[PDB]
Amino acid sequence: MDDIYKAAVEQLTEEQKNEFKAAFDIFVLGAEDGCISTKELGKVMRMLGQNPTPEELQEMIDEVDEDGSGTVDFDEFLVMMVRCMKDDS
């Protein structure tokens, strides 16, 4: 009845998202067309600074990819980044 992940991408300005675009493409080989492998997010998370553990990143994906796609895109990965840091949940 509120959805907090909707604002997560609504707070990032095009000038900000572009920052991830440069790194996101670092691991998008395959996965539909513009998605990375849940196993690559690790190197992508510590690439900008955030160094979360893989034990928590995998679980989240299981709840994010109900279809077990095993691959996130700029639409899913973003939710994981705003869900790892703080501020506005």
Side-chain angles (χ1 to χ4, degrees):
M1 62 208 283
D2 202 9
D3 227 78
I4 76 183
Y5 311 153
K6 226 301 116 186
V9 177
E10 226 204 78
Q11 266 182 226
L12 305 167
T13 75
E14 245 168 331
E15 225 310 275
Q16 247 225 31
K17 231 113 59 159
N18 253 261
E19 216 82 11
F20 272 134
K21 181 237 244 213
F24 185 87
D25 289 287
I26 301 294
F27 284 109
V28 193
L29 50 133
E32 228 305 340
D33 214 304
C35 311
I36 70 173
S37 131
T38 54
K39 220 180 270 180
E40 304 302 342
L41 217 187
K43 237 130 120 111
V44 162
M45 261 283 173
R46 60 127 241 207
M47 263 273 260
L48 254 87
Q50 283 270 87
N51 65 290
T53 183
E55 267 144 286
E56 242 218 34
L57 287 158
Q58 218 85 72
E59 224 82 59
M60 262 193 250
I61 282 134
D62 231 59
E63 311 175 10
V64 169
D65 267 8
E66 181 279 294
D67 55 356
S69 22
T71 44
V72 277
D73 56 19
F74 223 142
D75 193 314
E76 306 264 70
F77 171 52
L78 253 187
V79 179
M80 258 190 243
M81 258 294 307
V82 310
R83 190 83 183 121
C84 200
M85 56 150 89
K86 70 232 255 184
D87 240 280
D88 290 326
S89 205

